[PDB]
Design a protein around this ligand. Sequence first.
Ligand SMILES: CC(C)(C)[C@H](NC(=O)c1ccc(N)c(Cl)c1)C(=O)N1CCC[C@H]1C(=O)N[C@H](C=O)CC(=O)O
Lengths: 88, 174
Amino acid sequence: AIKKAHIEKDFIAFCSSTPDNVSWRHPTMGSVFIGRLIEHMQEYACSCDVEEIFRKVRFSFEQPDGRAQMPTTERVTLTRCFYLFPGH
Amino acid sequence: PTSSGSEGNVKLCSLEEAQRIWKQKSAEIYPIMDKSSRTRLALIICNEEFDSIPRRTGAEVDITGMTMLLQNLGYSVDVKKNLTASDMTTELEAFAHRPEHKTSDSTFLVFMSHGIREGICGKKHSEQVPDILQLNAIFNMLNTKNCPSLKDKPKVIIIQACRGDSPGVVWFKD
Ligand SMILES: CC(C)(C)[C@H](NC(=O)c1ccc(N)c(Cl)c1)C(=O)N1CCC[C@H]1C(=O)N[C@H](C=O)CC(=O)O
């Protein structure tokens, strides 16, 4: 028998800046957002769900530094917490 | 405490803390498939060398870091480089068709390129002839209609790209 499912569900997108605005990349050290996301995933994947980790990344950008940017999560249809349970 | 394992520098979730999390709001956590049999996939699309846009030097550091991180988290990582928007669409449709998603619990997609307000720049982009991939197309290609194998499973999209030319700041008096 056929059943209906939501056509769009269980998505989260995380962008490196807010609309209209630049993101920064260091020519030898890589993109600031990417490096910060990796650090936060490494530190917090064990204890926080992905939405909370993205919030912490956002918080880490909160004070500008001459190269300001604010990561933005977009189009979120996660219905549950996504824990990565690193090691399992 | 060693980074020698498959998880590298990612701090591990102890099975103490795991069942602590898994019992506090179990009805509201995405289920994880058995580690011995699951086939998680991730896709990284990175454009560093462009026909008419300056090269994104440092991009290789981003590729290395995200590839190792996603592997550390349990994903088999496909890395594709210097694609047009059409090439990106073709790669995403192929990724949506991968049989491993059936025996996976989740996926990550990472896009790293120049960007404008409208979306992500393909290899051949110029303001004369734009070569843009919209975020809306990415969602459509991975949704339940076009990627039924990922129905009910978290799909995480990471985008490193400018969204315009503005500095993102305003002055205020201290
Ligand atoms: C790489 C660069 C020399 C061009 C420059 N970076 C620095 O001047 C710098 C100097 C010291 C530092 N500690 C850090 Cl962190 C950075 C930079 O990034 N930009 C210049 C303006 C907009 C923005 C940019 O090009 N955004 C791309 C948008 O599409 C995002 C992408 O390509 O990923």
